[PDB]
Amino acid sequence: NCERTFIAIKPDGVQRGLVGEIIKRFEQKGFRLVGLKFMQASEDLLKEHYVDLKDRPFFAGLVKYMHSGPVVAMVWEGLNVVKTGRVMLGETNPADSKPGTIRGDFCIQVGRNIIHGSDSVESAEKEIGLWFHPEELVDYTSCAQNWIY
Amino acid sequence: NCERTFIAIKPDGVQRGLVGEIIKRFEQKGFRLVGLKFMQASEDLLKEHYVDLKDRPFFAGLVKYMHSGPVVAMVWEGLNVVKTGRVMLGETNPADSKPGTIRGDFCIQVGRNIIHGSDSVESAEKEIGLWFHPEELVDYTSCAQNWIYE
Amino acid sequence: NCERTFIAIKPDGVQRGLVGEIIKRFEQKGFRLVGLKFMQASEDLLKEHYVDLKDRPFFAGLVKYMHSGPVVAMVWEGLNVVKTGRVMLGETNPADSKPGTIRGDFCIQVGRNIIHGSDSVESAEKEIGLWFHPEELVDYTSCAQNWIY
Amino acid sequence: NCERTFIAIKPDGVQRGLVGEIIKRFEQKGFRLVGLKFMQASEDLLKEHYVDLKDRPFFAGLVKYMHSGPVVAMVWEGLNVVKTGRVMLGETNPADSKPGTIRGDFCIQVGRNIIHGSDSVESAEKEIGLWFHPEELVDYTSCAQNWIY
Amino acid sequence: NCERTFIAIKPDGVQRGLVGEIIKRFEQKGFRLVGLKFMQASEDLLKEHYVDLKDRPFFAGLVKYMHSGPVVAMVWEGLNVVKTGRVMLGETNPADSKPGTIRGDFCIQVGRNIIHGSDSVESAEKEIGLWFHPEELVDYTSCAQNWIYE
Amino acid sequence: NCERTFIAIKPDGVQRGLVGEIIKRFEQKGFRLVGLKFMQASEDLLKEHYVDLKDRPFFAGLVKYMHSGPVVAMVWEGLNVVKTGRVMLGETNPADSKPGTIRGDFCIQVGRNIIHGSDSVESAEKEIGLWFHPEELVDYTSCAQNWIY
Ligand SMILES: *S(=O)(=O)Oc1ccc(-c2c(-c3cccc(OC)c3)ncn2CC#C)cc1
Ligand SMILES: *S(=O)(=O)Oc1ccc(-c2c(-c3cccc(OC)c3)ncn2CC#C)cc1
Ligand SMILES: *S(=O)(=O)Oc1ccc(-c2c(-c3cccc(OC)c3)ncn2CC#C)cc1
Ligand SMILES: *S(=O)(=O)Oc1ccc(-c2c(-c3cccc(OC)c3)ncn2CC#C)cc1
Ligand SMILES: *S(=O)(=O)Oc1ccc(-c2c(-c3cccc(OC)c3)ncn2CC#C)cc1
Ligand SMILES: *S(=O)(=O)Oc1ccc(-c2c(-c3cccc(OC)c3)ncn2CC#C)cc1
């Protein structure tokens, strides 16, 4: 219920003008915006973030693509926000993503797939700690909370 | 082909500002608005409406939640409007609801799931009769009818 | 602040599928929905409602047009809802209506201008009393009230 | 990656005002508009286009429906545009079509299902050649190409 | 009600993905789509089209910009479609264009102002004749005509 | 045309779910997102920011309202972004704001007017320096730059 997930709008997402469109979907869904910042990620940050993919054939090109422009880093709160957030994003490969999902509606190739979401609560807490100082995560009550829960 | 279903935007749906957004989806889909009204439902109306759920652990809290604010009661007409309407709403639990559906796009918890739709033609006719007098259901021809149905 | 206006989506507005679109604009603006109903208006109701236009050349045709299909009658509440509501509708003649307004965005000819709004607080209270029984007007507090006022 | 599909907005789609709405979905997805034209299709064109359905009970009525008003014929380019285009359209019967898809969002009956897409690369090249002269298909580079691929 | 205007989405408009968005505004307004085509315009066509601006300092660069990519050429029909179309586009300089208008919502600099509309009925008929063969302009009745015009 | 302006989404704007909607308008207009962050502003920051309004009757209540929840602070770049940004916001009092503008579309009372924009280039550079460290302002080229200018 106070669960948190880390959502990152990739450089292609920013370049193609989907920041507002993506944020809008999390807002209208009911989730609470906890953190938000706009930054060019360093390669050391990206390598730690994508560490499970370290020895994959695409990993070099992934780190380059993600360093190439700025990203919108975000933190969203709510019941099953990690799982439901992943569903809203759609499948990691946009080829598999359904219409209605962010990737399904807005992108084509896996190498340029506009958005990242945390795969689990464990990954979420690691990625949140990695991308944000705790001082940057804002605590407040949504005025619509009693109508969402 | 002029089958009818009952749709009710719950109090959280009204409070969160989704009335127009929800109605828009039925309009752009092609279905015809037959009835529409804004009312605070009494507990006797809600208890009859949700009578199949009478002896469920949540039933007391459901009736309270639904009494707490006003609802937009509606009646929509068209081919398989009951079944297709249910699909557009998405799964009753928003956790299962797909993006693209009303619940999937706009709500999180099952207890605050913004909208009701009739589960069958049998339930639809019972719920329509329950929520509307027959005088309130307007009959007219959509100007786009020949481009929606053959 | 507890001021009310009467808004009515004309038959062409209902026929062309603008009910949700119109309602959405009042919702997102911040105004509170007080009353809403869907009815075929009788000629005696329409003649009383448009009584100031009784002896105009179009009046007969206006009353027929408004009787021809159903209308969505509404009541909205908020600070200067009558004046601001009129602004959102745009000029009565759509030829004069600005893009951004309901008539400006959605209709062309004055004879088929999709929506009515009350011109003043006086007209509003007369039109509300005329179209609604007092039992049909619902009283409640918006959860966003402290962020609107 | 330079694959093309043929997309036709049927007469009901044009009549109901979905041309912009449909085109918008292909644009925001990332696909490149290659060809676009507005024409009343002849019965010989329609009979050749729907030749695989020649001896079906609905075929006469299909050809009539498609001749009844104008259509927006289109050609779109991109990676798996034929397959993904089909997915975006949704199932041919709107009864089966999912919310989020064009047919799922915008139509009800199979006989009036607003849009056609090519079922395969083979059908696409036949349908493109059938509906367009090669001079009408415009070649250019999307400014967002490096962020789509 | 049978008046026609020539609307054209410039190359920047096509490149930035506003074709559907622009067309949508004319559709939802009530105007009838009469002609539509996607073409790279030749310099002789553009020079004839912008002939009143022939001896302006920007004219060379205008013709180049308009030749650089494809355009969506269109023809729309309805009551005061030329005047109202111009209003919907907004002021030619986007700096002056109001929010709600196409240029006001979607572009910044006058040199890249995404759309053209005919300034008058006279210009409209010249521009329509210039950009379209008469066989390409489709005639039909909108199913919503009786709800748009009396 | 490398002007920057400071735009801030007030607490009511965040609470009512307009962050994506507001950002979308700047994106689709053509302006480049330079900085973005989500923070609860301190009273010393707000008092310095609204220093020209220091001795106004509402100033105490303004500072309280702006401290009450978090804000989305932003920096946008482009030709006349300060002036055009102000136009897109609409008049400071929503009563005067036109439909089509952010305040005109989304809010009612001056005390809860959802968004701030810089009034001039001078104020913009002061407000940017005040709300952002220079390290937080990201520099990059829009892929659509040659089609915007
Ligand atoms: S995002 O969080 O989805 O980031 C991301 C991770 C992994 C992939 C990927 C790729 C791939 C292919 C071509 C080029 C790439 O980067 C330039 C990446 N292939 C498979 N996966 C999914 C996995 C695991 C893309 C994006
Ligand atoms: S709506 O028409 O879906 O109304 C509604 C009916 C049933 C449920 C429900 C619940 C549930 C859980 C927690 C709290 C509740 O109300 C306060 C209700 N659990 C399962 N269902 C679906 C069934 C059967 C919610 C809403
Ligand atoms: S609604 O409130 O817009 O109702 C309404 C009132 C008055 C007019 C109108 C007409 C006119 C012209 C042609 C046909 C008509 O009805 C069939 C009406 N001419 C001027 N006005 C504006 C005024 C006062 C239309 C609609
Ligand atoms: S479009 O490409 O969707 O065109 C189209 C092709 C086939 C069908 C169709 C029909 C059907 C039913 C009733 C009336 C019709 O036309 C007037 C067509 N039944 C099945 N299919 C799909 C197949 C195979 C509809 C539209
Ligand atoms: S379109 O119809 O908007 O075509 C068009 C005509 C005139 C202008 C224009 C310019 C200008 C400035 C810099 C560069 C240009 O083209 C590359 C054009 N300056 C004033 N106007 C408006 C007039 C008259 C732009 C576009
Ligand atoms: S923002 O930049 O829009 O901040 C802002 C500044 C000033 C006003 C304002 C007020 C006013 C009235 C009642 C309550 C207030 O704050 C709680 C503020 N009265 C006039 N202005 C216009 C100016 C400047 C509102 C918002």
DSSP E48-88: HHTGGGTTSTTHHHHHHHHHHS-EEEEEEESTTHHHHHHHH
Helices C19-29, B19-29: crossing angle, 10 deg rounding: 160
How many other C-beta atoms lie within 10 A of the C-beta of residue F51?
11
Helix (H) or strand (E) holding E129: helix E121-131
* Residue from E30, E114, E37 nearest E77 by CA: E30
* Residue from B105, A114, C83, B25 nearest F17 by CA: B105
Q: Which of C15, C16, C21 sits opposite B20 (nearest CB)?
A: C21
DSSP annotation of F137 reads S
Residues sharing a CB contact under 8 Å with residue E118, sequence separation 6 or more, in sequence order: E5, E6, E7, E82, E85, E86, E124, E127
Structure token digits, residue C142: 């918006």
- Tell me the C-alpha distance between C56 and E39, whole Å: 50
* Residue from F123, F135, F138, F34 nearest F78 by CA: F34
**Is residue A138 within 8 Å of A34, Cβ to Cβ?**
yes
- Tell me the C-alpha distance between A26 and F12, whole Å: 17
Helices B19-29, B81-89: crossing angle, 10 deg rounding: 140
- Tell me the C-alpha distance between B104 and B88, whole Å: 9
**Is residue C15 within 8 Å of E144, Cβ to Cβ?**
yes
DSSP assignments along B25-77, one per residue: HHHHHTPEEEEEEEEPPPHHHHHHHTGGGTTSTTHHHHHHHHHHS-EEEEEEE
- Resolution given for this structure, in angstroms: 2.8
| Fold for the domain defined by E1-150 | Alpha-Beta Plaits (3.30.70)
Is B92 annotated in some ligand binding site?
A: yes
Report the C-alpha dihedral over residues A91, A94, A98, A100, rounded to 10 degrees: 100
Please compute, for residue A12, the number of CA atoms within 13 A of its CA located in the half-sphere on the CB side: 25
Instruction: Tell me the three state secondary structure of residue C149.
Output: coil
- Tell me the C-alpha distance between F24 and F18, whole Å: 10
Tell me how close the Cα of C80 comes to any Cα of chain F, in angstroms: 8
Strand D71-77 to D32-39 pairing: antiparallel
Q: Give D98 Cα–ligand 4 centroid separation in angstroms.
A: 18
Helix (H) or strand (E) holding E90: none
- Tell me the C-alpha distance between F113 and F124, whole Å: 19
Residues sharing a CB contact under 8 Å with residue D86, sequence separation 6 or more, in sequence order: D117, D118, D119
Q: How far is CA F46 from CA A128, B146, F19, F41, F77, in A?
A: 28, 60, 20, 7, 23
Structure token digits, residue A60: 């070099």
Strand D71-77 to C115-117 pairing: unpaired
| Fold for the domain defined by A1-149 | Alpha-Beta Plaits (3.30.70)
> Does the annotation mark B116 as catalytic?
yes
How many other C-beta atoms lie within 10 A of the C-beta of residue A56?
11
Buried b (16+ CB within 10 A) or exposed e, B65-89: bbbbbbbbbbbbbbbbbbbbbbbbb
Is the CB of residue F123 below 6 angstroms from any atom belonging to ligand 6?
A: no
DSSP annotation of D99 reads B
Burial of F83 (0-12, 13-18, 19+ CB in 10 A): middle
Strand partners, B32: B77
Structure token digits, residue B113: 């799931």
Structure token digits, residue D126: 């036949």
D127 backbone dihedrals φ, ψ, rounded to 5°: -65, -40
Burial of F44 (0-12, 13-18, 19+ CB in 10 A): exposed
Handedness of CA D85, D89, D93, D96 (dihedral sign): positive
DSSP annotation of D111 reads G
CA A89 vs. chain centroid, Å, equals 8
Is the CB of residue A113 below 6 angstroms from any atom belonging to ligand 1?
A: yes
- Tell me the C-alpha distance between D107 and D101, whole Å: 10
* B–D interface: beta-carbon pairs under 8 A: 58
Handedness of CA C136, C139, C144, C149 (dihedral sign): positive
B103 backbone dihedrals φ, ψ, rounded to 5°: -65, -40
What residue of F is the nearest CA neighbor of D145? F143
Is the CB of residue D58 below 6 angstroms from any atom belonging to ligand 4?
A: yes
Nearest bound ligand to the CA of residue D110:
4
What is the residue whose two structure tokens read 């219409």?
Answer: A99
How many H-runs (helices) and E-runs (strands) does chain D carry?
A: 8, 4
